[model samples]
Target: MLPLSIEQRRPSRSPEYDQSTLSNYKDFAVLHTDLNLSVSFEKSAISGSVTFQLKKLHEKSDELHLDTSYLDVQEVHIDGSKADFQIEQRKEPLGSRLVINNASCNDNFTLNIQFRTTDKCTALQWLNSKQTKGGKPYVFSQLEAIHARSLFPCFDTPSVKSTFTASIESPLPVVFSGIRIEDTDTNIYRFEQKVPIPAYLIGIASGDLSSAPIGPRSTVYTEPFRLKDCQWEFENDVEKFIQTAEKIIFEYEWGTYDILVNVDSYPYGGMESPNMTFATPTLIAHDRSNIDVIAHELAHSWSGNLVTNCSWNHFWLNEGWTVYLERRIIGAIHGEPTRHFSALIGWSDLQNSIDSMKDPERFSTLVQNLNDNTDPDDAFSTVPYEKGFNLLFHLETILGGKAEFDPFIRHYFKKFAKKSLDTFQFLDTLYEFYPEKKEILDSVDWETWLYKPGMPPRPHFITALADNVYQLADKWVEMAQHLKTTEDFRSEFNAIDIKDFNSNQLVLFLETLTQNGHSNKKPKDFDWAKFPVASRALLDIYQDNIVKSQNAEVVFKMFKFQIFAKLQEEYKHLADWLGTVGRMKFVRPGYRLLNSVDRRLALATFDKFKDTYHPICKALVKQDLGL
Candidate 1:
């Protein structure tokens, strides 16, 4: 007998399942999960009970194992009786297997386990009242990749999906990933998620919070002091982005998409947690420049929350498609040029992301091979996000324009809605949908797109919008060499030149200037140290716009230029700024930028602010500094 096409293309079954999870999760399907939790400021931990309602998928399977890390298991019960369970020895990266002996189980059973988070819990980030702007204690969770087990024991892999119900007891207000159910008790908060999501998407934050409506369906939550500005930042575009994505993909599945402006220390730009999107405070750019991030997170309503990646190895399915849809939505509203401009910015980001990788060849592939006990978190980078988008963009260009690709977009999301699948399965659907275009699809070098490392084929974007910034960047590089006085530099570049440039455009200009030099042997055309006079002069001219602007994206870049210029006066200025924002996009790179010019100050700044950063951000920066 010959091998079937499905078998021939890798295996239809598994490349064995997510090695990141040591669970017999496939034996019994997770139907629903109930989380009963209480926050403790004294312990700086969350003591909770999680109950998993399961259905036997195989007749012979009698045991169930869940993933857990840095968790203290107190008791276990199966169907109302005390059941014997064991927490296996710790495994690196993958965590420990929580074993349950459900030998007397039937077709259906409920397993309730009582557990408490330990100090080493990776999922939750605890903030003392002093650390918060409003002087109130706050705690939030970032469980993506595999940290869900550290928060609460479960499969902890994206492959498993289940509905969730949470009843949380806390001293202050609380918001969860699921939609909140109105409650009378002041200290108790309740939520329900009818849409099944992976355990990693289960998010919780408890603090003194305030909310303001950004749209009829959306509200922005933040600390009370920052509520008004946060509301203004997102109000103008939240619904527009939602409607735009709905037109491109299907209608938004998760009912009400709300934004939670997490505390300053929130590491990622935005985490697409079902109903509540956890966003960084840095997005409040004051001038409404940073709201495009809302579009990206909103697109995840379909790409990630509904149609999910089976494992972190196939993460491009989640992030790549989300970036594709995000750009599509932005293009529909802002026009195609702006969309292409955003992709251009992403291209620089993709390059920088790959350049910074510890093992670029292994981790930079669009599809990751994490079956060898690799921390899915370690593989988290722009390779999956931008490279994945490029591959999809390539298909769009080759398989006709967006007009031709829209149909497949609808079909692909509709087919995989509410289910999880691997990359091979994603390919099968593509071939099945467009049998007429099989020749075109087959022409794609799947190896390079899926397996080969380094940057993928650069998809051509409309350079109309980007050309303006590139020209200005070129002018600045040229001006740095010739312009001898501050007056000469000011005449060539002024605030008016950037009056038309958005914060993102300014960021690209900085990125181009930073990446100008190809080798250490040759000084950069715009080398700040070489042209110290013009370097400070450049800062003098863009003072009000780039330097004065509160936008983290622009301010961070301007500071980088300052550090590169070896502006001794501004070294502590950059270090002091690190204490204010905890977003990893800024903090880690900010440390490196400072470290390159002044290692002593970088180490001093980290010691000063290390206690304020989220555990994940703090740990990563330690590795960055080789501490």
Candidate 2:
């Protein structure tokens, strides 16, 4: 018998088979969308009209429904005439629905919606001049999950795809998801996205932007102040990463893959917006050690952008495949040990993420059950990315390694190109692609992996790279337990202990030492507090490499290690550092760490610089801080 979760979610009451969306999206298909917008820094809003070309799917689907949240929808026009529309009552999770009476219209008709974004809009983050380093106002959109509804009126689910045409009027230069359409008039930016994308992928950023060529087709866009640094950071590796990804999967489909280093307050590590990627400023590691995020995002050009998840429940089909491809690209460039090392880090991250969830049993399932209309944002975690990668990795191993399973990767993406699908469809395709491995595929436990919760079966990683880090961590743990004199420990360990360790290896070592009882790992008595003198000496010796590093991953972990061990000297350091960085991956955890140690300072520190954070980051931090 199937798992109880599967039985419960399979009920037919859900709308369009997607439990999250309230719109009757299956009744019609939006073939194309034309967006005309004006970005107003003064008003902190976007006033625009979005037009959709629709084709009815069901004969009885006389009315068209669109998702809207905190939007001032001015007027609705159906086929060049005023149409009767109702702004429905607000609903939990799904937002308000815009119901239009299209009974009198043709099967293939047009819909024009005149609307303006409000301050309450969740999709947009409006940054004032003071918040930006360039001393100019900026605005960007993070519309993943369901926030796209607040940006415009349409089916705001990944199940639907449509080509986009944007004509945006802004005081500053604008960079959209689509490639810029060159025109003699430079004041208004025009863009065209021939590739059909979901509403969530409809991204916009406007600011005092400047660009430099990072690759032949890739241009890095950022604030004028950081233009030179961003160019230097990505110029040498963008094309190399692209070529590696192209070799793993199919050829590059998105033309002119560009990078936009968004404002410091941008919440996500990187958003895989088509044609252009929105990256966090923290990614400028100064050293080229942090370009893995770029590889992950570029892989999304195929996994999520080209082939998509029909519903949030199947989000793994988007993220998991991207990570699998991402690691393969990394493996090709940096060798297999580097890839395995990265996976090991992600494995710990997966465990930590699951342990941190409120309802681990429900949310930790690989195949999510959002039938109760749970907000997809709440379901966001590393579970999908890492666990999904593990499953794919397992399949690659069981189904006869890369040479045997590589063909299916190309077949799966090529078949689902420009299409959205669920996990079942993905499974069916895998079975269809490899009829010979039917028994092996069937033997693999789908229920435990997909429906079951907690942690999945751990896959063995190449421990060659992880061994040295563990040895050093083991030595530190022993020293913390007072196994040796502080003097002897100081003499034995020096800069050479970690001289050859890479940034990620250092991050892993810190993570190993910082493991508290609350996470998946067992409680360790060998904390920094156990032997203060040795911990201080240890910090002093590797001061240049670990303590004084600029890489966000390495430095953040160092602060976390200090805070977890209740190192009072570094408590203020974390608080000050939190204000300057704004990626949610760092900002959310930074607040949580500070809140754990000193609640008062965390609140005050946030109060001092909360205004500098993006809307998404500020809200999430408040929630994280329990304030």
Candidate 3:
């Protein structure tokens, strides 16, 4: 569910190449390939001829490092020439690289490489969901661009974008990449990525797969057992997706989009390569809540792959812009600002959660924060995604949305599209465009979001009862005042039907009843005397330990209390209950019960279960631990 950390060494502090070098776009292409691949457990072998366009290859020889780190290759030929190459081993501690040393070559070169491996490690893998289903191996690759270059001795790097024409020959029945389906037989499949990109952007997936054409340009691939389920869900939506993408791109100045949905256990949530997008099958919206995923990938047409990041540290350029773009595109599609605002509120709440967890004491920069030296998957968190996006969004909003923002963004791209950038580089770019905004921009701190874990918390307060919620206290105040004067049974009881509410809300209303009855008013309809044990258990938690205590800190302790309470009631579902309450926003009786509960308890529980916690929970706790 999470990616293991790939050892990251900061690239040469002062790389000589400019953004133009990185954004050249025309330099590399993954041309048509008639290749065959085999993976027997840990080992893999790939044999193919790669037709590529080098584009001004002779100019910068030092920048030409052949990325052969992810795979094992025995022989390689550049246009039939057995050229002498250097395999840089400096990065071997992180992972071995099979790089070609110094080489002077023409503008374009065609090369053939033959490679085989018996290593257990994999760049990308396809295993059946090790859970509910088994036996089906749906192929997928986790080539974070040049990482794939290691899998195959090819030109690796973001600066070398290419169009890929891939034909994957595997023992399985299916293979898919970026191409529109031109022809397909039982074993052989044809696909293409006409847009020129880099070798790292190449995508190859094969297995016992089935497909449903999403649109003329897009295809959805599903594992064997999930084939019927996928088809039933995505069959006709393909046209809708294409039209959605088309309208968004055509309305904007960005180019066309080529997207792919890999119904496999993609190591990460999704990756936006040049023309191809890879998403994990788990992200597929069963209830169809992936509108943001569509919008996010579509926005990449102008963000991640197009404008590009100069280096790994300047990742905000890729992730930040895409996050804002998701908001922009999705907002436009919905024709409202409320969703965006609500999402921001969600992010702000999340930031507050992080801040409450004391996230600032650990990593201090986006660069350092991005790759947990220990685990790469831990590196990708809300700080990078939300804070980065929020900063850019606020800047854009202050600058006048599309009016001032577009020009500023375009300038950023114009200056660094094919280059590397850091915090200072971007600040300088912004300053160059609007020097007067320097004070405004500088006054705004990046560390709040970059170095910190959480955001400002929502307003909340404690009540008199042990577990009583702020909301229930307010409600009880009203009900008691009403019954004290008239002794009304039905009137106050008829005010709000409790069943119309969720379990938490119903519990709160019952707590209010208990308190009001103790004070002055007694609502007859509630039949508090006959209340179920579940309802009684829910009320006692708030009354005895929470509402009556009136301690704000004890409010925080409710998380543990709730866990033990739930454990007593339904231990089998404790993990799920904790996860749901921990991540989601649920309206409870009081402010104390609502806010700050998850943060403190998360830290405490994280300490307890760090060793034995499941991977997903372990990730959650580690995030709390700032690991």
Q: Which residue segments of model 2 deviate by more than 4 Å?
A: 1-16, 58-61, 480-491, 516-524, 564-572, 588-608, 615-627
Task: Compute each candidate's TM-score over C-alphas.
Answer: 0.93, 0.92, 0.62
**TM-score, candidate number 1:** 0.93
Instruction: Please give the ranking of all candidate structures by TM-score, highest first, separated by commas.
Output: 1, 2, 3
Scanning candidate 1 in windows of ten residues, the lowest lDDT window is 517-526
- Candidate 1: where is the Cα deviation over 4 Å? 1-9, 14-16, 59-61, 515-526, 530-533, 592-610, 615-627
lDDT of 3 at 42: 27
Backbone clashes under 3 angstroms, per model: 0, 0, 47
- Write one digit per residue (lDDT tens) for candidate 3, span 1-627: 111121122234433122211222333433443344544322344444344444443223243444455455666666676755554552431345445422555556655666653243345553443311324445456665335654565544444445566655566654434554566344455566555444445566655555555555555565656655554445445345445544434333223343445542233456665444565444343434333555676566556555555444456666777777666665555434433543544464455545653345443235433331222333344555566676777676666556677677667765654344554456547767876656566555555434444442222212222133334444444543334433243344332333233222333444344443333344444432233333333334345433333222233234334432332332222323233222111112221231233445445544543333223434544654455
What is candidate 2's lDDT per residue for 1-627, written digit by digit as tens? 333454454535332267677777888988899999999989989998999999989645356888999889999998899998889998887889998888879889999999999888988888887677788998888899899999988898898999999999999999999989987754799999999999898899999999999998899999998999999999999999999988888789878889999988777677999988999898888887777779998999999899998888888888999889999999999999988988888898899889988888889989887873699876678888999999999999899988888999999999989989888778768878877788887777777887788788999889788888887887776655654565777787889999888888888888877753223344446456766776677678789889978889888988888887777878889999998898887888989999989998999999998888876688889888877
- Model 2 reaches what TM-score against the true structure? 0.92
Task: Please say which candidate is ahead in TM-score: 1 or 2.
Answer: 1
Q: Which run of 10 residues does model 3 get worst, by summed lDDT?
A: 1-10
Error of 1 at 247 (Å): 0.9
**In TM-score terms, which candidate is top?**
1
lDDT agreement of model 3 with the native: 0.46
Give me the displacement of residue 62 in model 3, in angstroms.
5.4
